[PDB]
Amino acid sequence: ELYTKYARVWIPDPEEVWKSAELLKDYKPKVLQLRLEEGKDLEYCLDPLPPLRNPDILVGENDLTALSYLHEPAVLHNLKVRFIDSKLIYTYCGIVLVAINPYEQLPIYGEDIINAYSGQNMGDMDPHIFAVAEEAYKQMARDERNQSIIVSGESGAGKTVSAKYAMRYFATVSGSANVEEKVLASNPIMESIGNAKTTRNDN
Amino acid sequence: ETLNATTPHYVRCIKPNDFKFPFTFDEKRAVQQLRACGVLETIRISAAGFPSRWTYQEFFSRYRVLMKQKDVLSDRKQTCKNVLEKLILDKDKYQFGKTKIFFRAGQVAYLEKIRADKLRAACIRIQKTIRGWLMRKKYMRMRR
Amino acid sequence: FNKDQLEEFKEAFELFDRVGDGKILYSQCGDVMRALGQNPTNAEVLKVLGNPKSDELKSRRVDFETFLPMLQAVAKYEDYLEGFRVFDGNGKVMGAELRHVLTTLGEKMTEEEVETVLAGHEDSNGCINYEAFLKHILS
Amino acid sequence: IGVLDIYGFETFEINSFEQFCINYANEKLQQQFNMHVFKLEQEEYMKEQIPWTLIDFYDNQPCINLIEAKMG
Ligand SMILES: Nc1ncnc2c1ncn2[C@@H]1O[C@H](COP(=O)(O)OP(=O)(O)O)[C@@H](O)[C@H]1O
């Protein structure tokens, strides 16, 4: 139990899955009076509580599990602000890397950053696909046990380009006189024989 | 059979918008993606347990304002082990590991709330003293 | 307050009367309370003033006799030290950080107040011994 | 080190045998994922001497059995 005047909560909306809301009158252990965007009018009928919102210093953190309140509003907000405002496309949840299609190019994949990630532990750095490739390359040394990086998502999410950069990492840090040319030159073949226009998207 | 013989590391890719607009984001698709990726379940499951895990020294670096210049001990692990018991009466909200403090969801936001209110009370003290000095200074100048 | 205190305080109060009616503005009441050794917050000052509105705060004038109950109410070591020790652990406080927090948190002050109070209190690193600064600023 | 580029869980205004296969493959992959996460946090709790009973995981074997078992 914390809800007061000047608390904030998330409320559902058909237009955007949650709206931020200012709590306008203190809670009493039955319907809540709320201020909003666009002026203020709501009273919101609890059923036999609204999701409650992380203090603004937390939001934008590198790791969605580092938030104090965990829920779909908080996650969607962190990813939205990191993507739109900070132009950061990589984020962590638990062990899972989460990657969002910036869908225009970026500097971020430069060899300088490749070298900056080498040897770093995964929590030492801001998230990047090179941090996952580097953790794989570490684990394969720490144990002989082989390592798999599983890239998954909807079509068009960027699974192929994420694999491309994950391989570019190994080929820069380990690689020497070549794999890279041949593997990347295989892509137009495998895309021709194995990709199709689906209803929702081409390729 | 190929993957179970291995150790996985996961990357989930999500597509922001259906229209190919550069670097803009649609809530309604993105939530569908983040459910289809199992991320929301992983987050809920972590929220049921002890999501937030603080190294004692990071806990100190955050909440030095909470812990009295008197109370701090010759080791900060025991210092914080005491101070948190001061701040939250019931351990069940938290756990003490070997290397980290474990917290249930929300207790960190509580600690940040009480931390910020105490920091503003300290700012009230210091600002009130400086502002009162300037008031005194101009007052005695008018008397002068 | 005794007769001697009331007489000195009234004389000072009348020195602050800029209209000749024997009165000061509400906005000066806090200044008078602070000048007499009290350290009330602006919130406390507005409370004893009755949370006045802008118009009466800027133009309504009160004599010593109406000020007096408020001064009395406002009038009635370890906390000052801990308040400075918040920003300590070598016994120093950044001038930039203290300036920023005092001008951006709480009852925000002007940069000139902070420069005036901090003058001569910072060392070559730009560090202030806050125990000495605190004793100095409380006198 | 092996890198796997696989289509994700799919849902369309119409769903057909292709989607049914894609979603069954994603059931299997996420069974693996949930077991790996569950293992990792039992091992962290053994690094930290915390009881295992606190932690649980989503079990999707009943849906794999619905699709895959005999009389599935
Ligand atoms: N990280 C990224 N940086 C820049 N452009 C990207 C990135 N990810 C995806 N894209 C763009 O989005 C397109 C679609 O993603 P792609 O990986 O080719 O499809 P799929 O993920 O279905 O294989 C890419 O061809 C590229 O134009």
Author numbering:
A (entry chain A): 5 to 33, 36 to 54, 59 to 187, 191 to 216
B (entry chain A): 649 to 792
C (entry chain B): 4 to 79, 86 to 97, 100 to 150
D (entry chain A): 433 to 504
Authors' description from the paper:
By using the actin cytoskeleton as tracks, myosin also powers cellular cargo transport processes and can serve as a molecular anchor and force sensor. The myosin motor domain consists of four subdomains: the actin-binding upper and lower 50 kDa (U50 and L50) domains, which are separated by the central actin-binding cleft, the N-terminal domain, and the converter domain, containing the long α-helical extension known as the lever arm. The active site of myosin is located at the interface of the U50 domain and the N-terminal domain and is allosterically coupled to both the actin-binding interface and the lever arm. This coupling ultimately enables the amplification of small rearrangements at the active site to large, force-producing conformational changes of the lever arm.
The structure of F-actin decorated with myosin-V in complex with Mg2+-ADP represents the strong-ADP state, which has high affinity for both F-actin and ADP and directly precedes the nucleotide-free rigor state within the myosin motor cycle. The overall structure encompasses all hallmarks of the strong-ADP state including a closed actin-binding cleft, which allows strong binding to F-actin, and a post-powerstroke lever arm orientation, in line with an earlier medium-resolution structure of the same complex. By applying a mask including only the central three actin and two myosin molecules (central 3er/2er), the refinement was subsequently focused on the central section of the filament (central 3er/2er maps, resolutions stated). The density corresponding to Mg2+-ADP is pronounced, indicating high to complete saturation of the active site. The β-phosphate of ADP is tightly coordinated by the P-loop (aa 164–168) via a conserved Walker-A nucleotide binding motif, which is also found in other ATPases as well as G-proteins. In addition to the coordination of the β-phosphate, ADP binding is mediated by primarily hydrophobic interactions of the adenosine moiety with the purine-binding loop (aa 111–116)—for brevity, hereafter referred to as A-loop (adenosine-binding loop). A comparison of the three states of the actomyosin-V complex (strong-ADP, rigor, and PRT state) reveals a striking similarity of the actomyosin interface. The remarkable similarity suggests that the same set of interactions is maintained during all strongly bound states of the myosin motor cycle, despite their varying F-actin-binding affinities. Notably, our data show no significant change of the helical symmetry parameters upon myosin binding, neither in rigor nor in any other state of myosin. The transducer rearrangements are directly linked to a reorganization of the active site that accounts for the reduced Mg2+-ADP affinity of the rigor state.
